Amino acid sequence: AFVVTDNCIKCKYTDCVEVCPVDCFYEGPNFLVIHPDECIDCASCEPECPAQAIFSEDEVPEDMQEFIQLNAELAEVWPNITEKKDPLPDAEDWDGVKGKLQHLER
Ligand code: SF4
Numbered sequence: 001a002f003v004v005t006d007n008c009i010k011c012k013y014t015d016c017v018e019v020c021p022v023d024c025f026y027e028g029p030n031f032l033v034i035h036p037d038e039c040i041d042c043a044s045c046e047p048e049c050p051a052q053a054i055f056s057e058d059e060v061p062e063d064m065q066e067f068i069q070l071n072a073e074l075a076e077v078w079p080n081i082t083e084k085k086d087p088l089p090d091a092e093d094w095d096g097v098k099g100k101l102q103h104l105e106r
């Protein structure tokens, strides 16, 4: 499984969804997650994230491990996002801001 991590929160560029062969991306208000059962590990999405927040499950950073499970949980309750849309309003300022987990919107 591929995993979206902390830097996607309040960027949510959604460039990732256009390259996914199986539409395994689920949409939160200020975040996107990858359904772990549906993701087929092609990694087409990982270069496409400006946030560089997508990671192969085995290479998700030691301090962002919570996100594996979070992708799994939220992918069960969030609607499917298949089309690219415009980034969140102040996305490039928030990009690179650490610890945005505190601000994740359900
Ligand atoms: S690795 Fe491939 S299948 Fe998995 S979420 Fe990314 S684009 Fe979709």
Ligand code: F3S
Residues within 6 Å of the ligand: 004, 007, 008, 009, 011, 012, 013, 014, 015, 016, 017, 031, 032, 048, 049, 050, 051, 052, 053, 054
């Ligand atoms: S910012 Fe998030 S919305 Fe997609 S392009 Fe990167 S994983």
